[PDB]
Structure formats: C-alpha cells, structure tokens
Symmetry: C3
Subunit: 244 residues, 3 copies
C-alpha cells in the first residue's frame, strides 16, 4: 500500500511512495520495505534500485498516526539487517533530500547515484536526538571524519556536489542513470559481489555502542529537549534547549 | 597572563597570547589553557572558540626558559584529556600556521575554521622524532591516509585549500566567521552535541601504542640523530643522519 | 634478469622488466623483487623507488612459468615491503591492475603518471580479494569510491587518484626520484616509526569466518570458468552465481 515495485532486465526498482510526507518513514513503510528487500530475486533480479516518489528520497521519520509507532525502531533495525544481509547490490537513486532516517537508509545502500538538487543531512542536533554507532561510523567513511564532525555537531547539509567530492555520491544522475548502472552490475559475477559487499560492510562500522555511548544516548532521547524540539516545530518558532 | 578569555552570547573565546614565540607551548601556557577549558561554561557558555594572537595559531613547543619543563609532557596530555572530555564543542579558528604540538592542538578542536594563509605540518621526520598514535590516527582521518603518509614520511605541509579539500578545515575564514558559527551551534541541543562528540572521538584514534611502535618511538627519541638535527639547524646546514 | 636495479646517491631504483607482458607478476619476477627489497640498503641507500618499464606499472598476475605456491611468494613480497625500514616511492608510470594495484598500494607513497589508472576488475572475473586489499583501498580512495571500484570494476584515473590521495603527486619517474632523494636526507628512525604505525592502522586484517567462506565460494565457482571463456572470446559473460 505504501511502496511500488517494478522489475526490468535483472533490475528490481523499489520505490518509496509517501510523497505527501516526502517519503518519511513509519511502522508500515519500513515493514513493507523489509519485505520487498528480502523477497527480491524470486524473481530473477540480480540488482536492486532503491528510490523515492516526488521531490525527496526520504525526508525522515513521521510516526504521527502510526498506530504502531511503539515498535518502529525494531522494524527499522530489521530493514537495515535485511539490506546488510542481502546478496543483491542496492543502488540508491537518491532523487532528492535524504534527511535523518532518510540518510541512514541512503547510507545502507551499496552504491549511490544522486540527483543534482539532492542534499544529505543529520539534523539531530536540532531535535536533541542521538544516533546509533553504525550511522556515525558509516557517515565518517563516506564524507570523511572532518565533514562528519560538522554534519553531526552542527547539522550541516551535504550538497550533491560535495557528496560527489567525498564519495558519498558515487555519481550524479537520475533514476534512469541509476537503473542503467544497476543493469551493468546485474551482469557481473554475483559471488564476487557478495564477498566484497560483506567484507566492505564489516569494515568495523557495525559497532556496539560503548557504555559511555549508551549513557549519553539514553540521556538525550529521554530528555525534555526532545519534546521542546517538536513543540517549537509545531509552533513555528525557535526551540529553547535546556540541555536536560 | 599567557592566554586571553572573553565571552559573547554563549560563546567563550580563548586566545593563545604568546605571539613573540608564535604561540609555542610550555608549562604555563598549557596549564592555563587547561583551566580555561574546564571552567568554560561556569559560566553560561555553550560553545568555545579557540584561537591565536599574531601571525600563527601555534608553532609547536618552546621549553626555553621553562622552569617546570620536566613534566610538561604530562601537563600536555592533561590539556588534551580536558578538551576530549569537555561537553563544550570547540571551534578552532586557525588564524595561521599550526605545527607540531600546534597541529595536535588544532586536531583536538571539534571543528576547524581555517585562515587562507594557515598551514599544517608535522616536521617530525626532519627533527628525528616520533608521534603518539592518536596524532597519527586523527591526522589520517582528517586528510586521508594517502596525504597523511606524505605529511608524516616527508614532513610535507598541508595548505588550507587542501585542508578544506579533505575536511581538515570545515570552512575557510576568519576568527569572526568562526565566532558566528560558534553562536549558531550554541543554540543547538547540548545533549545531542555531547553524545556525538564522545562517539566521534571514540572512533579508535585514541589508541595505545603497539609494542613495535613503542620500540621505534623510544629508539627515535633516544637517537643521536635528534641532536644532529638541532646542531645542523643551529649551524644552518643540511643535517646528516645515521639511523641512530 | 627480470628487473633492473640502479642507485644514485642514497636512492635505489628497482624497475620491473616484462613490458612484453605489461609487467605482470609471475613467480620469478615476484622472487627477485622480494630479494631486491630485502637486500636494499646494503647498500648505502636510504630510499627505494619502484617503477615499471614501458607503458604499464603492473597489468596484474601471470602464472605462465611450476608455480602453485605462488600465493605464498606474493605474500612474502608484501611482507618484505611492509617490513622494509626504507620508504618506497611508487612511480606508477602506467596502469596498475589487480595484483598490480595491490603492489602499488604497498608502496609508501605514489607518484602517478597522468595516463595511469587503477582497477580491481575482480567482479568481472568472479573472484574475491584478501581483506588488506579492501581495507587499504578504502583508506586510499574513501569507502564510497571503494564500494564502486570493488562492486563494479570501476577504474580510478590519475586525476581522481590525486583527488582522493591514492596519488600523492602526478609526475614522472624523475619526479619520484627527486622526491626520494629528499626523503633519503630525512631521519631514518622517524620514518621507520611512522611507516610501521601507519601500516598498522588495522588494514592488515585477518579474514573473518564469513569472509573466508564467500571467498572460497567465489574462487571455487563455475562463474570463474565462464568469465575466462567469455573474455577469451571477446563476449559478455552469462554468469549464474554458482
Ligand atoms: C547488521 C547491519 C546493520 C544493522 C543495524 C544498523 C543500525 C540501523 C539504525 C536504524 N539503527 N538505529 C538504532 C540502532 C541500534 O543498534 N540501536 C541499539 C542501540 C542501543 C544503545 C545505543 F547507545 C545505541 C543503539 C540501529 N542499527 C546498521 C547496520
Ligand atoms: C583521551 C583524549 C586524548 C588524550 C591524549 C592524546 C595524545 C596527545 C598528545 C600530545 N600526546 N603526546 C604524547 C602522548 C602519549 O600518549 N604518550 C605516551 C606514549 C607512550 C608510548 C608511545 F610509543 C607513544 C606515546 C599523547 N597523547 C590524545 C587524545
Ligand atoms: C603483513 C603485510 C601484508 C601481507 C599480505 C597482504 C596481502 C597481499 C595479497 C597479495 N594477498 N593475496 C592473498 C592474500 C591472503 O591473505 N591469503 C590468505 C587468505 C585466506 C582466507 C581469505 F578469505 C582471504 C585470504 C594476501 N594478503 C597484505 C599485507
């Protein structure tokens, strides 16, 4: 009900379809993606393109109305595990802004073909949030530690142009470009690709949060500032953070 | 006496004031810098800007005249510890050259706004010495392993265009530029900044030296070549090292 | 007889000499190189320069020649370079591909001719790399470009190599030799320390159980046969993932 799926010449394109929320995730969208990823190649697909409808790739998370908000985090980890464990290369066609969970998702693709007007961002410093370790480590490998520091510590946006600079975007292109490239890849040695994907993903980015990490991470999520961020956004005004 | 402290709109600015020696470090300067970091936000400050007076950010160390010079190496570790552990994000305004101890200092800053004429350098292989591991890891993360190899194996300077290029510098600009950036960050959510800083610093660069590293470290520090480099300098001639 | 060695004031230059097979590494070429490096500085030299003769740095690997324990030899060669007290400046004069890219990355610094390029064409031939090749490559071009070079045999040009740090400088053999001569006037102990610490950034990594498995599946696959046959006949492979 919330995604689209088309196959053509060995490439399965999966498409987020919540353009009204700019493809913001919730319980259902994530669950249906998990499912769509696992069942790809069933199907004689050899490659996956992951993209979005309308202007954005994925603007973040929007659990409002989500009858099942509660269990949206585990749903999300499931999505990631599935992508990680997939023998298919996932070419993300980042057709537009990738923000928050949108950037996490983008980063979990195996390759990135990026639209001229797209940008990438972790605005967590704006909402008082805290990221898991994989996000922080994988971001740093993609834009370099220094840019990573500024995206994380000051909510700085990575432009398509600079994504191409750092390697976060592998190419700048359209959906069709991404799909054309995926076709080339679908014609390569799958086992070669499967080994490489796996070694690459095991570079250490998948990291258990240290105790100091889990502590500060708990402290931020449970904080009243997380509430203020949302209220202030509700009331179209700047948040007054207490650091508490 | 050896540093300056001023505050504006939740931004504490700390300025190295030993311009007659190009801000080179010693006991007093290191000691006072430590006190300032720690007592920052005591205070309503939610961000620190760190910079140097005169033409240079920090040109290294000058134990000349230093009475407590024996235990300076520990004092220096404490400064880094204090910075690493501050909940305050630290914006380095690199107003000019950062060499040796100063490059280290610059790297311990959380973000870097670099002046067009500033440059970075570990002239280590010229003076016959060896770095701690952190210095090498954090460098690699910021300029990339390729460029770190050159800076370290051939004492090559990193100009500001290239620092902007790699992420070593987040922006190119003035003390003022950095301060206005520090003002924006000071309005972000403190607890999200603190979590991300901790995890970013725990990327593995704070690494204990392997056995063979400490053997090469001691051998270099205890070499005849360390003296040759100094006398050759004092005689304005090419040094002629021995590997000993 | 398969490499050239010359010395000019503290700089020892080793040249690969199979331009007729674009400097591809075989058992004897691998052997003599290992030796040359071990016996370097014996010898007043303080820096080494490594380059290939003709148009290529190293086109890859070549088991033409009684060479089954070739994989061990090729590992000793890297063990030798990693262990060498002297810094090795790679004058990458032409394309470095496969084992050739591996050899280039084991150099300590790289001066790259503007016409060279780099490539693991490993996904075209259904093969798998050792972990170090993948870690060092990521360190040198960034994780993002490494995924591309690894998952679709993307070539890295001298220009982007310069951009990412794979290439320190774009220049000639002469340029590399001049740079080595400077490096040979710096403090050896300081250089030895840095080299060791840098090489121990974690890239020398043992394959996990899962990696070793996929590695074996790939190497022992039929798709390897199909890749060689398809290549030989200038035609697209029809892989099966088996
Ligand atoms: C194994 C492949 C893989 C699995 C999971 C992930 C990421 C995806 C991301 C949405 N995400 N969000 C939270 C988590 C996650 O791991 N949460 C548990 C946790 C506990 C204490 C902490 F301090 C931090 C995190 C996670 N894991 C990344 C990669
Ligand atoms: C925990 C945050 C942190 C603290 C300290 C450091 C750095 C700062 C730098 C000035 N610095 N200088 C010497 C040391 C240092 O760690 N010296 C001990 C040592 C022992 C054997 C060796 F082979 C090498 C080093 C150090 N550690 C980096 C990060
Ligand atoms: C210690 C310095 C060093 C030594 C060796 C290597 C590289 C060089 C490359 C030619 N090369 N080729 C095969 C191997 C290699 O490591 N083969 C053993 C192996 C076992 C199971 C696996 F899944 C993967 C690999 C290797 N290691 C890199 C660095």
């Amino acid at each position: 009900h919330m995604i689209g799926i088309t196959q053509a010449e060995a490439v399965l394109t999966i498409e987020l379809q919540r353009p009204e929320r700019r493809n913001a995730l919730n319980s259902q969208l994530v669950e249906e993606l998990t499912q769509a990823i696992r069942k790809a190649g069933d199907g004689s697909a050899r490659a996956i393109v992951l993209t979005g409808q309308g202007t954005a790739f994925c603007a973040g998370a929007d659990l409002s109305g989500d009858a099942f908000a509660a269990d949206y985090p585990d749903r999300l980890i499931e999505l990631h595990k599935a992508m990680d464990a997939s023998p298919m290369p996932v070419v993300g066609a980042i057709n537009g802004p990738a923000i928050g969970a949108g950037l996490q998702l983008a980063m979990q693709c195996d390759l990135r073909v990026v639209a001229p007007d797209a940008f990438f961002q972790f605005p967590t410093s704006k909402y008082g949030l805290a990221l898991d370790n994989w996000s922080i480590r994988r971001l740093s490998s993609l834009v370099g530690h220094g840019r990573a520091r500024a995206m994380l510590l000051s909510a700085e946006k990575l432009t398509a142009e600079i994504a191409l600079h750092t390697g976060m975007a592998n190419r700048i292109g359209t959906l069709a470009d991404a799909q054309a490239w995926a076709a080339e890849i679908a014609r390569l040695a799958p086992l070669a690709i499967q080994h490489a994907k796996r070694v690459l993903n095991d570079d250490g980015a998948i990291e258990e949060a240290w105790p100091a990490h889990k502590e500060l991470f708990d402290k931020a999520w449970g904080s009243q500032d997380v509430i203020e961020a949302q209220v202030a956004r509700m009331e179209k005004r700047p948040p007054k953070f207490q650091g508490a």
